[PDB]
Amino acid sequence: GSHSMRYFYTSVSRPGRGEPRFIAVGYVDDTQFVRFDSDAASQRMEPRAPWIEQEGPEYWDGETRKVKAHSQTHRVDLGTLRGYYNQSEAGSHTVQRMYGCDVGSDWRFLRGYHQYAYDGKDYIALKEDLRSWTAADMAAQTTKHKWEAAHVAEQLRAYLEGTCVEWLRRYLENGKETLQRTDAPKTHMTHHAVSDHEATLRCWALSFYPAEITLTWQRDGEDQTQDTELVETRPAGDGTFQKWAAVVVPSGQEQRYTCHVQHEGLPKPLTLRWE
Amino acid sequence: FLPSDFFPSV
Amino acid sequence: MIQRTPKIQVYSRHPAENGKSNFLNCYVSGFHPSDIEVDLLKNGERIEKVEHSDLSFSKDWSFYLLYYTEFTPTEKDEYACRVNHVTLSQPKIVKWDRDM
């Protein structure tokens, strides 16, 4: 299928004492594979998936150097953003950066992205074409003009369409046994007698990967949205994901209702029915 | 694999 | 800044069976800023050896973390996740329900 590599950076200023917190995590699809945390002891990019441990010392040295360099750019950003917004040095603020690339089921480049936020709001992002910037406000516009002058977009576009894609493919090959494995949901339905006259049917999807899934209820073959609840997809903690969807039904009428499960690991959608 | 240190500050 | 209050789910890794070792999760998501306190409770008391995932965030910039520990469910013992965040005036406690 389609695949992605993404990095997520979070930098939070510590006005009380010392340097900002900086945490970087890297993902291939829904699998975290590296982390760097400024507060940790190693001061190294660390592995978080077994297949990345295939890489040797030059890789780890190189990733550590780059991620520490990015962390210093973010440290300078916090200061600069405080000035832009005329903010006091007393308060903590947050910067986030997310970037990466998608390839299609043929592993060709599809799309790249680089976005940057300040205090939880859009600040500046590359547009879909990777050739220009969107700036949310006049502070971000100042940045935009700076980065236009530096011709940042051109170097970033080269990374996203080039390096990012090549290394994604490398990882997908090296981690093939899990990264290219689809884990269809293990599904079952439970039944919770809610009162004398109503029952709740809960359709579970467990231990799936990747995280994308659709759970839908129908009654008599049509979509049921009334009296349903659908929880946010959540990590199991072993690398797989969980979700459920529930509907409240009149007791005795459970058979009209069907839960429909769509997932990349399923040859065709599953249908579950309480009988 | 990270991009090199070409991100400028804002 | 944004302030967005956390969403909390408390659940087990595996279908819970009394007497069988398992993992108790508290997934906190949709929050901003990232500073957050999360404890897992057994019978109202803080469980000491609790780990958590590396801080990350969704497309909409809101953060998410998983806090987890090994546990063995029991008919009697109550488990819960307790969360504090700037958005909350007091800690929010959500009880573990094995059916959710």
Residue A204 to residue A259: CA distance in whole angstroms:
9
H-helix or E-strand spanning residue C72: none
Reduced to 3 states, what is the DSSP secondary structure of residue C32?
strand
Produce one character per residue of A76-102: b if its CB has 16 or more CB atoms within 10 Å, e if not.
ebbeebbebeeeeeeebbbbbbbbbbb
Question: Residue A56: which H helix or E strand, with range?
Answer: none
Experimental method: X-ray
Residue A120 and residue C61: Cβ atoms within 8 Å? Answer: yes
Q: Do C56 and A32 touch (CB under 8 A)?
A: yes
Amino acid, res. A202: R
Would you call A16 helix, strand, or coil by DSSP?
coil
Closest chain A residue by Cα to residue C27: A234
Residue A24 in tokens: 């970087």
Note whether A232 contacts C1, CB cutoff 8 Å.
Answer: no
- C23 with A237: Cβ contact below 8 A: yes
- Closest CA in chain C for residue A240: C13
Beta-ladder partners of A275: none
Stretch (H or E) spanning A230: strand A228-230
User: Of A25, A1, A27, nearest to A167 (Cα)?
Assistant: A27
Q: What residues pair up with A99 in beta bridges, in sequence order?
A: A7, A114
3-class SS at A240?
coil
Amino acid identity, position C39: D
Q: Where are any strands of DSSP class E within A92-185?
A: 94-103, 109-118, 121-126, 133-135
B9 in Cβ contact with A73 (< 8 Å): yes
Q: Which of A118, A139, A116 is nearest to C33 (CA)?
A: A118
Structural contact between residues A167 and A101, judged by C-beta atoms closer than 8 angstroms: no
Q: What residues contact residue A202 under an 8 Å CB cut-off, 6+ apart?
A: A189, A190, A191, A192, A244, A245, A246, C99
Please state whether the peptide bond connecting residue A210 to the residue before it is cis, i.e. omega within 30 degrees of 0.
yes
Do the chains C and A touch each other, judged by at least 3 C-beta pairs below 8 angstroms?
A: yes
Enter the DSSP assignment of A51: G
Q: Which fold would CATH assign to domain C1-100?
A: Immunoglobulin-like (2.60.40)
User: For residue A229, what are the contacts with CB-CB under 8 A and spacing of at least 6?
Assistant: A245, A246, A247
Helix %, strand %, coil % of chain B (to 5): 0, 0, 100
Nearest to A178 by CA among A25, A32, A22: A32
Q: Give the tokens for residue A271.
A: 């249908």
A113 phi, psi to nearest 5 deg:
-155, 150
Distance CA(A244)–CA(C25), nearest Å, equals 16
Domains of chain A: 1-181 (3.30.500.10), 182-270 (2.60.40.10)
Resolution value (Å, 1 decimal): 1.7
Report which of A271, A270, A259 is spatially closest to residue A217, judged by C-alpha positions: A259
Residue ranges of domains in chain C: 1-100
Residue A250 CB neighbours (<10 A): 10
Query: How far does chain B reach from its first CA to its final CA, in angstroms?
Result: 23
Residues C90 and A81: their CA atoms lie apart, in Å, by 31
C-alpha angle with apex C81: C76 to C83, nearest 5 degrees? 155
| Distance (Å, whole) CA A191 – CA A272 | 13
Q: What residues are paired with C67 via a beta bridge? A: C26, C52
* Closest residue on chain A to C51 (Cα): A237
